[PDB]
Amino acid sequence: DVNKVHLKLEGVSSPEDIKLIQSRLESVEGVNNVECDTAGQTIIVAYDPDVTGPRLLIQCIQDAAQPPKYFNASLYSPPKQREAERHHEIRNYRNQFLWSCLFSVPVFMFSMVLPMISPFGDWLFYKVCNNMTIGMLLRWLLCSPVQFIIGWRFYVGAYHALKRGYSNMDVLVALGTNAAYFYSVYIVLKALTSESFEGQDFFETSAMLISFILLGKYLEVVAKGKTSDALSKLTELAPETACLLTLDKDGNAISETEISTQLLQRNDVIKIVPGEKVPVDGVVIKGQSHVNESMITGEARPIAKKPGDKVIGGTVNDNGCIIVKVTHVGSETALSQIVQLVEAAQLARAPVQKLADRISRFFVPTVVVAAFLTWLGWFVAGQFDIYPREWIPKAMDSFELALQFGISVLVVACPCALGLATPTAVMVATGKGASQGVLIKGGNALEKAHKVKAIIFDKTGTLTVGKPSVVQTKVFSKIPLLELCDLAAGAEANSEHPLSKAIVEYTKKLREQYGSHSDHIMESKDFEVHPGAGVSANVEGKLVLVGNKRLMQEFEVPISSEVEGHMSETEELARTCVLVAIDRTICGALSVSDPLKPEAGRAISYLSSMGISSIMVTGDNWATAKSIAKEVGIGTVFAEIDPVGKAEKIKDLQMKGLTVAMVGDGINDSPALAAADVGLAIGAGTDVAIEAADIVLMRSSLEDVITAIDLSRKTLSRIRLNYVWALGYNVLGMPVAAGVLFPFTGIRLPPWLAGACMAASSVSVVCSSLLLQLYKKPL
C-alpha cells in the first residue's frame, strides 16, 4: 500500500486525462508538490492525509473531467494481495510436482514391473542393436526431464554454495542424484560398445528421489502457507461502511448520508446507528452510546462512549447516536498496528537452527569421504586379488561391484530431518499459537520457554480486574438494598469521580440482581464537595451522608457496635470501606473488594503441580498482597515492591539458573519484562506488550498460560525424537550398504533399493514434524 493512491484513469490510456488533472492541480491547492504525471503511471504528485486525501483529492480528480461526467476515482491499491501471491507459490510448486510425477512414474514402472508379467518384456528385450534395447533407450530418453529440466533448483542451490564451500543440503542432494544417472550413462555406453556386455542400469533412483524430495518441499511450503494465513481472524475486522454528516458553519446540521471508506479522510464525521459496523478508526465528538469492542484483548471491553472517546474501527455499536470524526491514519489504526505484528509474525529466527546448521557442517564432507573410502577399499582389494572371487554376482566383476558399493552410500544418506523437520515444526507451533490466540514473536521465545519452573505475577489487570467491586453491605438499620441503590445514585449524581462511579456501579449491579426501576431519584441537597471523608447529600427526603466513620463524627451520626465490628471485618482482609448513613443514622457499610483474575483455583494451584512455583512480587500494599496470597496458592510474596524490585529480584532469580518468567501488563511493569528472559502478557492494553515481548496473548484470561507453556515443551518433544530418529536410522543402516564390511558374511542389498530407503526416511520425518497439527489444550 502507498500514500500516493495508484489510480488508473478512464479512457484506456487517454492522455487528456493527465492534461486535465495537470490543469486542475495548477488550479487547486493543498498539494505538497505538483510534479510530472506523464512520466509516472498514475497521480504520483506528493501529498498526505488530513490536509488532503480521499475526499478532496477524489473530488479534484473527478472535477478534472468536463462536467457533469467525471473521472470516477475511488481507490486502487493492493487491498490484500498476500493471498494471491502465496496461492501462486502453491500453484508453482504444484505444477512442478505435476510435471515431475508424470514422467517419473512410468520410468520407475518400466524396469520394475514389466519383467514380472512380460508379454511385453520381450518387446523391451527386442534388441535395437548390440546390447542396447528398447526399454533401456526409452528409460534413458525419459530422464533429462527429471534432473536436466525440473530439478535445476537443486543445481542453482548448489552452484554458488559449493563455489566457495561450507556446504548444505543442496550439496548432498545434487551429488546423490547426479552420480547414479551419470554412471548409468557410462555403463550403457559400454553396453552398446560391445555385444558380449551385460545389462543392469539405474535410472529409477534419480526419478524417485527427486519426486519424493519435491513432495517434501511442497508439504513444507504449503504448511507455511496455511499457518501464514492462519492469522486470519486478527485483521479481518475490515470496515467498508461509513457516513458523512455534513454540518453548517456552526456544526448544527446540513445533511446526513451513507458513504463508504472511499472518501474517509480525517475530519470526516460518521453517524453510527445501532448494529452498524464502525468506520475506520473514528473518535466520538458528542453523544453517549454503549459500544462493545475487542481488539487488543480477547475477553471483550464494553464502553459507554462519552462525548469524546476512542471508538475503535470495525466494532459493533450497541445503542446511541454519536458523531464519529476520523482522526487516525496508518499505524494508529489498531488493525494496522497488529498487522505490523502479523508482519512481525513473518519475522522470526530459530536459535535451534543454529545448532542444526552447525551439525550440517559436520555431516556432509564426512559422509562423502566415508563413502569415498569404500571405493578405494574394494578397488585395492580387487586389483591385488587377495580375497576369494566366487561370491561375485554373475555378469559382473571388479569395476561393477567397486563403484556399485561406492554409489550405494550417496543414495542411503538420510538427512531430511535437518532441512525440513525443524522449520516445519517451528512454523506449525506458531500457527497453533495463533490458533489459540498467541503471537509468538520469535522462535527464541519458544525455545527459551521450554525450561521454566517458576514465573512472576503482578496486579493491575494481570491478576486483578479494573476498579474494585463493592461486595459487602451490612445494613445496620433495615433499608432495602434497592432503596440504598436509589439513594446512593441520587447522592452521587453530583461530583462524579471514579470511586463515586464505583459506588454507582454497585448501585447498577444490585439493580440487575434485583431487576426493575424502583422509587425515585432525588438530586443531592446541602451537597458538600469533599471526597476526603465522603460527601454530604439529601436523597428521597433522607439525609444520605455517605462517608467513613470520620464523616459520621463530622455530621454527628450515631455510632453502634456494628460499626466497630465491620471495622474489624475490614481490617481482616483490607477491603477499603465506607459508611452509609441514611437519615443521619448509619444504615450498614459499603465494603469494597478488588476481584482477582478469577480462575486461579484451576490455573495457578494446578500449573504448580504440573511443575512451576509461583513467585508473586507486586506493587500493591503489604496487606492487600498478603491477603491475595492468603486466598489461594502462591509461595513467597514480596509486597510494597515497586517495579524496580521486580526487576532486581527477577534478575537474580534468572542468574541462579531457573529462567523465571514474568506475567504482567503495564508501562511500569515493562522493565521487568525487558530484563527477564521471556515475557508473557494476558491482554495487550499496555503498548509495550505490542512492543518488545515474547508470548503476547490475544485474550486476557491467564488459562492461556497453561496452553502456552505445555505447547512449547510439547514442541521440543517431537523435535528431539527426530534428532534421535536420524541418529537412529542413519548410522546403524548406512554401514550395511557402505562396503568395508561384507568380506565376512554375505547377503545382498542392491543400489537401487536405497532409493526407496532414503524415501521412507524423507517423508516420515515430515509426518512426525507435522503431526504437531492435531493438538488440544489440556484444561
Do the Cβ atoms of 150 and 99 come closer than 8 Å? yes
**Cα–Cα distance, 411 to 742 (Å, whole number):** 19
Do the Cβ atoms of 472 and 378 come closer than 8 Å? no
Enter the DSSP assignment of 275: T
H or E element, residue 325:
strand 323-326
Contacts of 656 (CB under 8 A, 6+ apart): none
Phi first, then psi: give them for residue 257, nearest 5 degrees.
-145, 150
Residue 679 three-state SS: strand
Can you name the residues that pair with 292 across neighbouring β-strands? 302, 316
Please state the domain extents for the chain. Answer: 1-77, 241-331, 348-431+712-779, 450-464+596-693, 469-593
Do the Cβ atoms of 6 and 32 come closer than 8 Å? no
Instruction: Kindly list the distances between the CA atom of residue 347 and the CA atoms of 200, 340, 342, 441, 696, in Å, as whole numbers in the listed order.
Output: 51, 10, 9, 7, 15
One CATH from 1.25.50.10, 3.20.20.80, 3.40.50.1000, 3.90.440.10 for 450-464+596-693: 3.40.50.1000
CA 184 from chain center: how many Å?
Answer: 49
Do the Cβ atoms of 678 and 388 come closer than 8 Å? no
Instruction: Kindly list the distances between the CA atom of residue 216 and the CA atoms of 138, 146, 516, 551, in Å, as whole numbers in the listed order.
Output: 28, 16, 65, 77
**Cα–Cα distance, 37 to 35 (Å, whole number):** 7
Can you name the residues that pair with 585 across neighbouring β-strands? 582
Phi first, then psi: give them for residue 461, nearest 5 degrees.
70, 30
* Greatest distance between any 2 Cα atoms in the chain: 127
Do the Cβ atoms of 751 and 205 come closer than 8 Å? yes
* Residue 466, CB-side half-sphere exposure with 13 Å CA sphere: 10
**Cα–Cα distance, 245 to 92 (Å, whole number):** 49
**Positions marked catalytic:** 458
DSSP string, 370-431: HHHHHHHHHHHHHHTT-S--SSSPTT--HHHHHHHHHHTSTTT---STTTTHHHHHHHHHHH
Contacts of 13 (CB under 8 A, 6+ apart): none
Phi first, then psi: give them for residue 325, nearest 5 degrees.
-100, 140
The class that CATH gives domain 469-593 is: alpha beta
Enter the DSSP assignment of 349: -
AA letter at 353: Q
In degrees, to the nearest 5, what angle opens at C-alpha 101 toward C-alphas 95 and 102?
Answer: 95
Is the previous residue joined to 68 through a cis bond, with omega within 30 degrees of 0? yes
Contacts of 315 (CB under 8 A, 6+ apart): 237, 277, 278, 291, 292, 293, 294, 295
Enter the DSSP assignment of 532: T
**Cα–Cα distance, 682 to 698 (Å, whole number):** 7
One CATH from 3.40.50.1000, 2.40.50.140, 2.70.150.10, 1.10.1660.10 for 241-331: 2.70.150.10
**Cα–Cα distance, 302 to 105 (Å, whole number):** 61
The CB density around residue 525, as the number of other CB atoms within 10 Å, is: 14
Q: Quote the cell numbers at residue 628.
A: 491475595
AA letter at 500: S
Do the Cβ atoms of 534 and 547 come closer than 8 Å? yes
Do the Cβ atoms of 769 and 722 come closer than 8 Å? yes
Experimental method: cryo-EM
CATH number for the segment(s) 1-77 = 3.30.70
Q: Burial, 426: exposed, middle or buried (Cβ in 10 Å; 0-12, 13-18, 19+)?
A: buried
Residue with cell 445503542: 319
Q: Do domains 1-77 and 469-593 have the same CATH topology?
A: no
CA proximity to 546, closest of 496, 614, 500: 500
CA 598 from chain center: how many Å?
Answer: 27
Q: Quote the cell numbers at residue 297.
A: 484483548
Do the Cβ atoms of 614 and 457 come closer than 8 Å? yes
What is the experimental resolution, given in Å to one decimal place?
3.6
**Cα–Cα distance, 270 to 283 (Å, whole number):** 9
CA proximity to 712, closest of 651, 676, 661: 661
Do the Cβ atoms of 563 and 549 come closer than 8 Å? yes
Q: Quote the cell numbers at residue 514.
A: 434485583
Contacts of 537 (CB under 8 A, 6+ apart): 490, 491, 494, 524, 525, 526, 527, 543, 544, 545, 546
Q: Quote the cell numbers at residue 433.
A: 499459537
Do the Cβ atoms of 591 and 612 come closer than 8 Å? no
AA letter at 404: Q
